[PDB]
Design a protein around this ligand. Sequence first.
Ligand SMILES: O=C(O)C[C@H](NC(=O)OCc1ccccc1)C(=O)O
Ligand SMILES: [Ca+2]
Ligand SMILES: [Ca+2]
Ligand SMILES: [Ca+2]
Ligand SMILES: [Ca+2]
Ligand SMILES: [Zn+2]
Length: 316
Amino acid sequence: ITGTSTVGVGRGVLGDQKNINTTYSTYYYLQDNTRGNGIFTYDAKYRTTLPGSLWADADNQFFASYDAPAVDAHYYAGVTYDYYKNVHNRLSYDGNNAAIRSSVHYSQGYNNAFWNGSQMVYGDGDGQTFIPLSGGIDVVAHELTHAVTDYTAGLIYQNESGAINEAISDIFGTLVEFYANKNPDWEIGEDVYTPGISGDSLRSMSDPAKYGDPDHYSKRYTGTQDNGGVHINSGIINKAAYLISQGGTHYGVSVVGIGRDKLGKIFYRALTQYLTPTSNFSQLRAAAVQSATDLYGSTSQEVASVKQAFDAVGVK
Ligand SMILES: O=C(O)C[C@H](NC(=O)OCc1ccccc1)C(=O)O
Ligand SMILES: [Ca+2]
Ligand SMILES: [Ca+2]
Ligand SMILES: [Ca+2]
Ligand SMILES: [Ca+2]
Ligand SMILES: [Zn+2]
């Protein structure tokens, strides 16, 4: 909507106070004009009709319980926009400053978040498996990264291409969490998962097998569940990415870590230049090796580490 850019204040899902960019026109709306062609947050009002209504507030103070998921969706979309712009020189998910739209309060008891082809959508959780899913910066960034994938490599959401799609969202979700620098880790979803259990998460990049996901190509899931295991076999790629950044010896194969910035550069260039809708794991290895070669040179440590990481997880 047309109005004047304002700055509101609120509390997120975890009870932390933050400022948010709003727009005033009779009401204060969750519309951030400071980034691209805007970031817009909507109320789905416990229904499944999307997007719902652009979030309106009478006083530009967002401290009600009902507000908290909106605050976080809106703020973390901004952080994610900033990461892609500042770190990768990418303007929004399409590279041309597309408006970023999110809806919160989707459905009832909904233990999921998603990118629907056009916008991000966040459940509230059931309060047992999840609390509102926008409370996780890694979750927000995971979802916005689906949009980046769809505009770039376009990895088909099944089997190996789908597992790469998933891993790319976990990787950049994690890199965004490190960019924001609040309790960062190589775990996925820990801020919003199981409020009754401390120290767990939905997936782990550092140790995918902790949560039953494969950490080696020989352990890949070959069935038909989960679109051919897209959230399962992502563990193989997540582990490779973790190793490229942090190093380690895995199944006897030693990898010299090169750190998160270089991981992000390698994978961003692979995603945007080399991967295609049908890329498989072997092709991702080649894309990453070529990307590291472009950036750092064929004889570089970075290239060597990429090869060792994919060797460690059994991807040739
Ligand atoms: O399964 C689905 O419908 C989509 C799936 N959503 C999903 O797993 O929602 C919760 C969550 C998302 C990211 C990180 C941690 C938790 C996806 O985004 O890949
Ligand atoms: Ca208010
Ligand atoms: Ca964390
Ligand atoms: Ca995390
Ligand atoms: Ca937990
Ligand atoms: Zn996903």
